Design an enzyme around this catalytic site. Structure first.
Site, short mmCIF file in Angstrom:
data_model
loop_
_atom_site.label_atom_id
_atom_site.label_comp_id
_atom_site.label_asym_id
_atom_site.label_seq_id
_atom_site.Cartn_x
_atom_site.Cartn_y
_atom_site.Cartn_z
N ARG A 1 0.09 -10.47 12.54
CA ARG A 1 -0.55 -9.37 11.81
C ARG A 1 -1.35 -9.90 10.59
O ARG A 1 -2.44 -9.40 10.27
CB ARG A 1 0.54 -8.42 11.30
N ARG B 1 12.73 -7.02 6.43
CA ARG B 1 12.73 -5.55 6.31
C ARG B 1 13.60 -4.96 7.44
O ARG B 1 13.47 -5.34 8.59
CB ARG B 1 11.32 -5.01 6.38
N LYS C 1 0.81 -1.20 0.00
CA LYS C 1 0.00 0.00 0.00
C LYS C 1 0.86 1.27 0.00
O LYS C 1 0.59 2.21 -0.73
CB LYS C 1 -0.90 -0.06 1.27
N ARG D 1 12.04 -3.39 13.05
CA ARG D 1 10.84 -3.00 13.82
C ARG D 1 10.41 -4.14 14.72
O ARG D 1 10.55 -5.30 14.41
CB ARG D 1 9.68 -2.66 12.96
N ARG E 1 -9.74 -0.53 8.83
CA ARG E 1 -9.27 -1.92 9.04
C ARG E 1 -10.33 -2.78 9.67
O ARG E 1 -10.09 -3.99 9.84
CB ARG E 1 -8.01 -1.95 9.90
N1 LIG Z 1 5.10 -5.10 -6.21
C1 LIG Z 1 5.92 -5.60 -5.35
N2 LIG Z 1 6.74 -6.64 -5.55
C2 LIG Z 1 7.54 -7.11 -4.62
N3 LIG Z 1 7.85 -6.46 -3.46
C3 LIG Z 1 7.09 -5.38 -3.20
C4 LIG Z 1 6.19 -4.85 -4.16
N4 LIG Z 1 5.56 -3.79 -3.58
C5 LIG Z 1 6.14 -3.65 -2.41
N5 LIG Z 1 7.10 -4.52 -2.18
C6 LIG Z 1 7.88 -4.62 -0.98
O1 LIG Z 1 7.09 -5.14 0.10
C7 LIG Z 1 7.42 -4.50 1.39
C8 LIG Z 1 6.23 -3.73 2.02
O2 LIG Z 1 5.77 -2.77 1.14
P1 LIG Z 1 4.85 -1.64 1.74
O3 LIG Z 1 4.56 -0.76 0.71
O4 LIG Z 1 5.37 -1.11 3.00
O5 LIG Z 1 3.48 -2.43 2.07
P2 LIG Z 1 2.27 -1.96 3.03
O6 LIG Z 1 1.06 -2.65 2.46
O7 LIG Z 1 2.33 -0.51 3.20
O8 LIG Z 1 2.61 -2.74 4.34
P3 LIG Z 1 3.07 -2.28 5.81
O9 LIG Z 1 4.40 -2.92 6.00
O10 LIG Z 1 2.90 -0.85 5.99
O11 LIG Z 1 1.98 -3.07 6.70
P4 LIG Z 1 0.66 -2.69 7.27
O12 LIG Z 1 -0.20 -2.17 6.21
O13 LIG Z 1 0.47 -3.91 8.20
O14 LIG Z 1 1.09 -1.52 8.29
P5 LIG Z 1 0.38 -0.15 8.73
O15 LIG Z 1 1.45 0.88 8.82
O16 LIG Z 1 -0.83 0.10 8.08
O17 LIG Z 1 -0.09 -0.51 10.30
C9 LIG Z 1 0.91 -0.83 11.26
C10 LIG Z 1 0.16 -0.99 12.60
O18 LIG Z 1 -0.48 0.20 13.00
C11 LIG Z 1 -1.72 -0.10 13.56
N6 LIG Z 1 -2.77 0.33 12.64
C12 LIG Z 1 -2.59 1.03 11.45
N7 LIG Z 1 -3.77 1.38 10.91
C13 LIG Z 1 -4.74 0.91 11.84
C14 LIG Z 1 -6.12 1.02 11.81
N8 LIG Z 1 -6.86 1.53 10.79
N9 LIG Z 1 -6.85 0.54 12.88
C15 LIG Z 1 -6.09 -0.02 13.86
N10 LIG Z 1 -4.78 -0.14 13.95
C16 LIG Z 1 -4.07 0.34 12.93
C17 LIG Z 1 -1.75 -1.62 13.66
O19 LIG Z 1 -1.18 -2.01 14.91
C18 LIG Z 1 -0.90 -2.13 12.48
O20 LIG Z 1 -0.41 -3.47 12.61
C19 LIG Z 1 8.61 -3.54 1.03
O21 LIG Z 1 9.87 -4.13 1.35
C20 LIG Z 1 8.39 -3.30 -0.46
O22 LIG Z 1 9.63 -2.88 -1.05
MG LIG Z 2 2.41 0.78 4.87
#
Ligand SMILES: Nc1ncnc2c1ncn2[C@@H]1O[C@H](COP(=O)(O)OP(=O)(O)OP(=O)(O)OP(=O)(O)OP(=O)(O)OC[C@H]2O[C@@H](n3cnc4c(N)ncnc43)[C@H](O)[C@@H]2O)[C@@H](O)[C@H]1O
Ligand SMILES: [Mg+2]
Ligand SMILES: [Zn+2]
Length: 217
Positions: free
Chosen positions: A171, A127, A13, A160, A88
């Site tokens: 997760r 990562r 994302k 992390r 979420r």
């Molecule tokens: N096309 C492709 N091919 C191959 N490789 C690829 C590629 N595209 C990307 N890659 C690689 O893949 C990896 C990841 O890419 P990346 O782009 O970072 O993927 P992402 O989907 O953003 O994943 P996150 O790692 O941010 O996870 P998340 O969505 O669980 O975390 P969030 O911050 O929302 O949430 C974190 C925490 O915050 C809290 N949280 C956040 N939002 C909420 C909410 N709405 N309600 C409650 N708690 C929340 C929760 O505790 C949650 O666990 C990279 O190394 C990238 O280079």
């Molecule tokens: Mg993210």
């Protein structure tokens, strides 16, 4: 352009969001990034969210909805926005519907970036983050020149608290369960789009773009 990116941990994302924002100039609203910024600043919101995040659990709905309700009230969201990892839960989605109504805005697309769990686990495990500039690395697919050190500024890298295998498996399970009804919610509303996230980063973006340019009907 009022958009949500939905996807399991690692689906790309943020990687897509950077691309979308560079092309379209709408704000990127990542609740995870917002929480992590507060945690780095060790503010009360940060320390509240930390206890959940570090364990791979969702932050509770009420505080999360509130950060989004405040964030969407800014003037930079008047012509569009990109929510990333919010909603979420169904409760968050029902609260967003009311926010948006209040704002006189409608979600236009909820994009599910679909990637199978096996690939997710591989994307995340390994990562590492630079403590100084926040640049990401991966041990397997994008290692630094010197292990533990960032190429750009020599800053020390870390893992992390939530990116170890056990926490990534957790997760994935928490979000798989919460996302099932949430996908149903938005499929009922006819705003759910599916993108195959198991393509190179540029091609995922082309496919997303086609949904955003209105070409994929
Ligand atoms: N096309 C492709 N091919 C191959 N490789 C690829 C590629 N595209 C990307 N890659 C690689 O893949 C990896 C990841 O890419 P990346 O782009 O970072 O993927 P992402 O989907 O953003 O994943 P996150 O790692 O941010 O996870 P998340 O969505 O669980 O975390 P969030 O911050 O929302 O949430 C974190 C925490 O915050 C809290 N949280 C956040 N939002 C909420 C909410 N709405 N309600 C409650 N708690 C929340 C929760 O505790 C949650 O666990 C990279 O190394 C990238 O280079
Ligand atoms: Mg993210
Ligand atoms: Zn760095």
């Amino acid at each position: 352009m009022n958009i949500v990116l939905m996807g399991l941990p690692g689906a790309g994302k943020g990687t897509q969001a950077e691309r979308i924002v560079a092309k379209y100039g709408i704000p990127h609203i990542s609740t995870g990034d917002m929480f992590r910024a507060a945690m780095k600043e060790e503010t009360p919101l940060g320390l509240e969210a930390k206890s959940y995040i570090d364990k791979g659990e969702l932050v509770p709905d009420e505080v999360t909805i509130g950060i989004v309700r405040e964030r969407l009230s800014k003037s930079d969201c008047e012509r569009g926005f990109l929510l990333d990892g919010f909603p979420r839960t169904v409760a968050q989605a029902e609260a967003l519907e009311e926010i948006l109504e209040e704002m006189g805005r409608k979600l236009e697309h909820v994009i599910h970036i679909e990637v199978r769990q096996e690939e997710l686990m591989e994307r995340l495990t390994g990562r590492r983050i630079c403590s100084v500039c926040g640049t990401t690395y991966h041990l397997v697919f994008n290692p630094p020149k010197t292990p533990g050190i960032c190429d750009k500024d020599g800053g020390e890298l870390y893992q992390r608290a939530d990116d170890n295998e056990e926490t990534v498996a957790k997760r994935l399970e928490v979000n798989m369960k919460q996302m099932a009804p949430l996908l149903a919610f938005y499929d009922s509303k006819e705003v759910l789009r599916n993108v195959n996230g198991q393509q190179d980063m540029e091609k995922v973006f082309k496919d997303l773009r086609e949904l955003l340019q209105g070409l994929a009907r």
